[PDB]
Amino acid sequence: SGFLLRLAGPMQSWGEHSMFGERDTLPYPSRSGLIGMFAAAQGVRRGDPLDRYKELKFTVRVDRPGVRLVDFHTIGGGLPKERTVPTAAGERRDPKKATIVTSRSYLADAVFTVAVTGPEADTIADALAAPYWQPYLGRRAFVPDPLLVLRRRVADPVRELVEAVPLPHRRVEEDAATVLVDLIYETRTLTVLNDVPLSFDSKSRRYSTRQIRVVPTEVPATLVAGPGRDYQNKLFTYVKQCAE
RNA sequence: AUGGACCGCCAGUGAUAAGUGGAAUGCCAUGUGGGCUGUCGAGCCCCACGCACGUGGGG
């Protein structure tokens, strides 16, 4: 069981440890984010129990790391002296000091191939194919890849990440095989981070620590696509035999 | 419905005033394009007259 989401598109930003103006993202997706996306695809309002999404497994193969960019983001500026974002007491600020400036970072031009393995994976897949809310990647303004769900049904999808999945073009030496690609499994762990989601309600966001271990694996060089227009093509023909 | 949902960095601006590329210069000295030559029967149809050899009219 399981399916292979294809995390790609113009921009991605999985945030963490940022409860102020300055927002930051991780160099790889976080289960809280994509579990929020499945939850958004199944129609569970914030505050509902998320126990159903427990018992899931997410190994993610990073195709390209992508470069980090900072997004400057001012909110409430230029508006007249009687329209901004109120204060808790209700007394607005002076228009010269009214707007609030947040500089939210984001990860750009990267593509990940996650491998979901869970008991509810089939309904999750069928929910992503038709959701009850626009599914996004990190934040609402980021639009996901069209091929959000690369392969809908595969037994042992991890083996599919280790072999027979298209990769974007990169420098490959002559008649060289064994090109390394990093994938994260969850001793010899890399880091601990607040990912497991316990509650999404806006009144009390509650998360917990989760282990992460990045293993650099080797893949045969027969997956690297060509210079341009070849990668998207090869992945289309790859998603073509999904019916078969 | 994802440390996310809502969300503008942004309202003003001459790059400006001045300027010869200029004075000098044979592309030249040499060449057959040549031998050879008479311009003297399948066509598609109609009609008319016919000595069944043909003759003329309209397409």
Side-chain angles (χ1 to χ4, degrees), chain A residues 205-217:
Chain A
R205 306 180 64 69
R206 191 171 186 268
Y207 300 97
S208 293
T209 57
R210 195 258 296 166
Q211 305 286 321
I212 194 169
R213 171 185 66 189
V214 65
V215 64
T217 190

Side-chain angles (χ1 to χ4, degrees), chain A residues 154-235:
Chain A
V154 174
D156 192 1
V158 178
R159 181 69 64 84
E160 188 67 27
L161 265 60
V162 183
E163 65 184 2
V165 164
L167 272 74
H169 188 203
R170 66 180 65 189
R171 295 293 182 184
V172 297
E173 197 176 1
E174 296 293 327
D175 71 6
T178 314
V179 289
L180 280 79
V181 286
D182 298 332
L183 72 165
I184 55 167
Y185 289 159
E186 66 183 2
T187 61
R188 56 185 297 273
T189 180
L190 186 152
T191 189
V192 185
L193 72 165
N194 292 317
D195 281 337
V196 285
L198 294 175
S199 178
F200 284 162
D201 196 71
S202 303
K203 197 170 178 65
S204 289
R205 306 180 64 69
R206 191 171 186 268
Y207 300 97
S208 293
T209 57
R210 195 258 296 166
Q211 305 286 321
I212 194 169
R213 171 185 66 189
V214 65
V215 64
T217 190
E218 60 90 19
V219 74
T222 317
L223 297 172
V224 177
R229 299 287 185 182
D230 196 1
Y231 178 64
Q232 62 182 358
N233 193 359
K234 288 176 70 175
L235 60 90

Side-chain angles (χ1 to χ4, degrees), chain A residues 8-229:
Chain A
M11 290 89 75
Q12 295 173 355
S13 178
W14 287 273
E16 186 193 356
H17 63 273
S18 16
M19 288 186 183
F20 293 104
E22 180 68 27
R23 297 281 184 178
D24 59 353
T25 189
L26 288 172
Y28 52 86
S30 66
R31 66 179 294 163
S32 181
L34 60 83
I35 283 170
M37 188 179 73
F38 305 138
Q42 286 184 353
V44 297
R45 292 179 179 89
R46 289 189 291 269
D48 294 330
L50 295 172
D51 292 330
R52 298 190 300 169
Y53 291 100
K54 196 178 287 293
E55 299 291 328
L56 272 72
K57 293 169 70 176
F58 301 102
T59 176
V60 312
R61 188 188 71 188
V62 63
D63 291 331
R64 69 170 74 93
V67 58
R68 308 279 295 275
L69 288 189
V70 298
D71 189 2
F72 181 71
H73 193 192
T74 297
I75 58 169
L79 234 30
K81 195 181 182 294
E82 201 70 22
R83 214 185 331 177
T84 62
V85 285
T87 44
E91 290 293 327
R92 80 285 190 189
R93 293 181 184 176
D94 192 76
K96 297 183 290 294
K97 300 178 183 180
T99 180
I100 61 171
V101 64
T102 62
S103 178
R104 55 190 68 189
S105 179
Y106 69 92
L107 188 153
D109 201 1
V111 63
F112 303 97
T113 60
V114 301
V116 179
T117 302
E120 199 180 1
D122 57 355
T123 65
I124 292 170
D126 289 330
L128 268 298
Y132 179 29
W133 270 319
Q134 345 310 359
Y136 51 89
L137 305 184
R139 59 177 59 95
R140 183 67 177 271
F142 296 170
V143 57
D145 204 12
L147 279 76
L148 187 59
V149 63
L150 187 60
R151 188 70 63 91
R152 186 176 65 247
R153 298 290 178 88
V154 174
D156 192 1
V158 178
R159 181 69 64 84
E160 188 67 27
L161 265 60
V162 183
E163 65 184 2
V165 164
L167 272 74
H169 188 203
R170 66 180 65 189
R171 295 293 182 184
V172 297
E173 197 176 1
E174 296 293 327
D175 71 6
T178 314
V179 289
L180 280 79
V181 286
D182 298 332
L183 72 165
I184 55 167
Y185 289 159
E186 66 183 2
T187 61
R188 56 185 297 273
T189 180
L190 186 152
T191 189
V192 185
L193 72 165
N194 292 317
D195 281 337
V196 285
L198 294 175
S199 178
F200 284 162
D201 196 71
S202 303
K203 197 170 178 65
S204 289
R205 306 180 64 69
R206 191 171 186 268
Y207 300 97
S208 293
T209 57
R210 195 258 296 166
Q211 305 286 321
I212 194 169
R213 171 185 66 189
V214 65
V215 64
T217 190
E218 60 90 19
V219 74
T222 317
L223 297 172
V224 177
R229 299 287 185 182

